[PDB]
Structure formats: structure tokens, C-alpha cells
PDB file of C-alpha atoms in Angstrom:
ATOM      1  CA  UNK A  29     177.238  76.494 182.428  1.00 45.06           C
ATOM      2  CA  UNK A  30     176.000  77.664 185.970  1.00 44.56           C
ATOM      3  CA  UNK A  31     176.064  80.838 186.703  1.00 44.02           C
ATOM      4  CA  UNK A  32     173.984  82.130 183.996  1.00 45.32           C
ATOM      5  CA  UNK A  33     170.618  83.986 184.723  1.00 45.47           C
ATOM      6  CA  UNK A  34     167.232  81.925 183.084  1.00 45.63           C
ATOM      7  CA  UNK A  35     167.383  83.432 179.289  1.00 44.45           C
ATOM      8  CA  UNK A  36     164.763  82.995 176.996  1.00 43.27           C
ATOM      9  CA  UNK A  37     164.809  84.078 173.364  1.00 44.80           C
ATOM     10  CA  UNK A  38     162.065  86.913 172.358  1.00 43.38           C
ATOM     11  CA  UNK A  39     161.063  84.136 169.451  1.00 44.12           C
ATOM     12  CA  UNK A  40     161.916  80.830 167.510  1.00 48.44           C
ATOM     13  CA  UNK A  41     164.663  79.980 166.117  1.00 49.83           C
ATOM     14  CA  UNK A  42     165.143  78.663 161.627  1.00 48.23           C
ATOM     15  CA  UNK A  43     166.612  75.899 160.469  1.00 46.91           C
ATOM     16  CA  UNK A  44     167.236  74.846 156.884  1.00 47.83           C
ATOM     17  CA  UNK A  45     165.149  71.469 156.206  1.00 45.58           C
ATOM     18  CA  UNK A  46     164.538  71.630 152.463  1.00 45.87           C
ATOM     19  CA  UNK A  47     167.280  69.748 150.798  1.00 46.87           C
ATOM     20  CA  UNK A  48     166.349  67.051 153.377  1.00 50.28           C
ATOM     21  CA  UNK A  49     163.142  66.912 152.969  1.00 48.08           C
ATOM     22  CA  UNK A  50     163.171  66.561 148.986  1.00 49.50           C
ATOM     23  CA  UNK A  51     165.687  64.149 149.254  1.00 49.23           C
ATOM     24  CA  UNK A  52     163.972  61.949 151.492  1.00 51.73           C
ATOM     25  CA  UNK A  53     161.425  61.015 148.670  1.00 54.23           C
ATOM     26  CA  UNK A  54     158.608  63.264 149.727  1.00 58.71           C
ATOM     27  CA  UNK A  55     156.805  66.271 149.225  1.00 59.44           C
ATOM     28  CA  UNK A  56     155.856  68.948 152.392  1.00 57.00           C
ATOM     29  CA  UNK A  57     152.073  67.811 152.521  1.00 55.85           C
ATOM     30  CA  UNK A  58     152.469  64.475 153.888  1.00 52.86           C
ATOM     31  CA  UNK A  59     152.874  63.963 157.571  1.00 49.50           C
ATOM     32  CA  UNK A  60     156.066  62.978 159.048  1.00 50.68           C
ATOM     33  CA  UNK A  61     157.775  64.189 162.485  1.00 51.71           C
ATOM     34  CA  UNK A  62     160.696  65.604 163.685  1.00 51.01           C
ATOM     35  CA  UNK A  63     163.138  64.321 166.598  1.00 50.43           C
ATOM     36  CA  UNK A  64     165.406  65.983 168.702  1.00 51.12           C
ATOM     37  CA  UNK A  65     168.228  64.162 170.310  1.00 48.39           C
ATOM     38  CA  UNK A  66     170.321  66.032 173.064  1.00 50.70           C
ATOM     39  CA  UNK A  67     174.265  65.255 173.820  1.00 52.07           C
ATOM     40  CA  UNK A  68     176.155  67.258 176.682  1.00 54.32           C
ATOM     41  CA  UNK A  69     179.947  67.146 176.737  1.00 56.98           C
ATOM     42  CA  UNK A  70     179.516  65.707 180.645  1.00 57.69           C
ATOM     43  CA  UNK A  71     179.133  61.992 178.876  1.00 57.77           C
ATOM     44  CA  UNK A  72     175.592  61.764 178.893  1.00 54.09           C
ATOM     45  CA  UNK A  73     172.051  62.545 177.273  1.00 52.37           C
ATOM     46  CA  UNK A  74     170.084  64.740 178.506  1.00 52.51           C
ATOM     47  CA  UNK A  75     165.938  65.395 179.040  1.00 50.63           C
ATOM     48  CA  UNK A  76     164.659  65.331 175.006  1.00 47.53           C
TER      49      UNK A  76
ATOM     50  CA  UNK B  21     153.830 103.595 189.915  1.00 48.82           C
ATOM     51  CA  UNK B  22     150.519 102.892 190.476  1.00 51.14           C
ATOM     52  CA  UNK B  23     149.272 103.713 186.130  1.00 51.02           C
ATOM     53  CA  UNK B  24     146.951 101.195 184.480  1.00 48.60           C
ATOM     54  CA  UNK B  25     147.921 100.582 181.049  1.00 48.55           C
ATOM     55  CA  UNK B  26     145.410  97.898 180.220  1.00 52.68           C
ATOM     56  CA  UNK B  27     144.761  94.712 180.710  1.00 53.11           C
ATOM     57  CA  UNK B  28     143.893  91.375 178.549  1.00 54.78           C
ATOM     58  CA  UNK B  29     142.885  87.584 179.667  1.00 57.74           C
ATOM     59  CA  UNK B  30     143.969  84.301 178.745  1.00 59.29           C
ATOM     60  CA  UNK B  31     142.371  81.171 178.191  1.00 61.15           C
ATOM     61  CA  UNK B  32     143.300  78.080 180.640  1.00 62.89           C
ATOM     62  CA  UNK B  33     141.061  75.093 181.767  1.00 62.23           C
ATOM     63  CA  UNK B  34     142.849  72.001 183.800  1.00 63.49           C
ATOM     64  CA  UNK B  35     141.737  69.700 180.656  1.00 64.35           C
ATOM     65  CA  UNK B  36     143.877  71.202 178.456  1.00 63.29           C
ATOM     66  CA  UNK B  37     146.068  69.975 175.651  1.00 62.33           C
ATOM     67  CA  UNK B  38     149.607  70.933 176.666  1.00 61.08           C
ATOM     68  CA  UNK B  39     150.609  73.775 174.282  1.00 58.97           C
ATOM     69  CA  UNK B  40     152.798  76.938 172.854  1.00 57.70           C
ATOM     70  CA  UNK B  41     152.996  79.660 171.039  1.00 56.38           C
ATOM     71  CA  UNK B  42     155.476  80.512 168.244  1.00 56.07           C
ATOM     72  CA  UNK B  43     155.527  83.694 167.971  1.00 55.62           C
ATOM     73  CA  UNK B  44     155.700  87.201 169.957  1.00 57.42           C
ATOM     74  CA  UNK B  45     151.858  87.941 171.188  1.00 56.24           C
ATOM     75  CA  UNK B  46     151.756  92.058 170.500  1.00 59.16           C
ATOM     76  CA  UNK B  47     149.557  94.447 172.742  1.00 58.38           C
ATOM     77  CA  UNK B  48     148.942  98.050 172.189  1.00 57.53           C
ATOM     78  CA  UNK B  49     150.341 100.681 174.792  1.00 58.61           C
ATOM     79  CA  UNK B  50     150.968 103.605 173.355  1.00 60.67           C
ATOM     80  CA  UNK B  51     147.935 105.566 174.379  1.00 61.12           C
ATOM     81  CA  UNK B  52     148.740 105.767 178.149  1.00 61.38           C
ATOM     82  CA  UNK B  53     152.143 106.558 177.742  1.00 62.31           C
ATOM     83  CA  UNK B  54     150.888 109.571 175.084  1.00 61.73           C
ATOM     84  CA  UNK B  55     148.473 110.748 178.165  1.00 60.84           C
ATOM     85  CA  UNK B  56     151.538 110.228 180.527  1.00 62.09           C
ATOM     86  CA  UNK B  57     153.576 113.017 178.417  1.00 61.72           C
ATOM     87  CA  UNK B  58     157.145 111.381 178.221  1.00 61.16           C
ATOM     88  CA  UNK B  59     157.795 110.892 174.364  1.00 61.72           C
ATOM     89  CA  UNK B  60     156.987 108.016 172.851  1.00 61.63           C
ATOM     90  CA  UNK B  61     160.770 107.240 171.413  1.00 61.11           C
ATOM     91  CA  UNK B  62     162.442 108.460 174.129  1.00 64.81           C
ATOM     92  CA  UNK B  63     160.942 105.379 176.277  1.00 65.64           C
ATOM     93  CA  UNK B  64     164.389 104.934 178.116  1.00 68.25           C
ATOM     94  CA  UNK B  65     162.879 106.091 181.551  1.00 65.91           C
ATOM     95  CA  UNK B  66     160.239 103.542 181.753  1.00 63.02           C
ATOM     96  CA  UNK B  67     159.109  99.943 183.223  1.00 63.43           C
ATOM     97  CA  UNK B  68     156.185  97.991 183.651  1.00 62.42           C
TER      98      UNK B  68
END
């Protein structure tokens, strides 16, 4: 919201990818990236 | 307070490849606080 103090988390934070990622039709040594795609419920995008 | 715990540097020139780190850097501090007296576990009194 607003009135939250600046928070940041002590470390990163897991995702499952594997099912994905042997289901796209490759293995985890060849090079691909990774997007991330922001939606806030004010009706717009946000900074990526 | 005025106790030196230690001290460390980092590395930063102007040319550099914007960057991060994933994970929690650790440093050692226990000695100082053993010389200081207050137990180690107890470390609810403390701040740096």
C-alpha cells in the first residue's frame, strides 16, 4: 500500500520451474531467459 | 558505543557491470562480543 516501512527480504525467494522447463522441449544446459511481467490492481503495468 | 568489531571492504569501480548478490554475505563477530563479556546467546541487549 503506503504506509509501509522499505522491507527487504534477508534472501531470495523459490519457485518451481521444472515441469515447465521439460515440457518446453529442452534440457537445463541450454540458454534461454526468463521474463517478468508486473500487473497492479490500479489498471496499469508497472516498472519490469 | 564507541567498540570496533571489525571491518571488511568491497569492491566498486564506476565501469562496472550492474550487479547482485543472491545470497546472505556472512561475517564473523563473535570474538569481540566474547571479550565484551555479555553471553553470546543471550545477544538481546545489543546493536551495531
Amino acid at each position: 500500500g503506503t504506509a509501509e516501512m522499505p522491507w527487504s527480504f534477508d534472501r531470495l525467494y523459490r519457485y518451481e520451474i521444472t515441469e515447465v522447463l521439460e515440457k518446453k522441449g529442452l534440457s537445463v544446459d541450454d540458454a534461454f531467459t526468463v521474463k517478468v511481467e508486473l500487473r497492479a490492481l490500479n489498471g496499469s503495468i508497472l516498472s519490469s | 558505543c564507541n567498540h570496533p568489531a571489525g571491518s571488511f571492504s568491497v569492491l566498486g569501480g564506476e565501469t562496472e557491470m550492474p550487479f547482485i548478490f543472491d545470497r546472505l554475505y556472512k561475517y564473523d563477530i563473535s570474538d569481540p562480543v566474547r571479550k565484551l563479556g555479555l553471553k553470546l546467546d543471550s545477544a538481546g541487549d545489543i546493536d551495531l
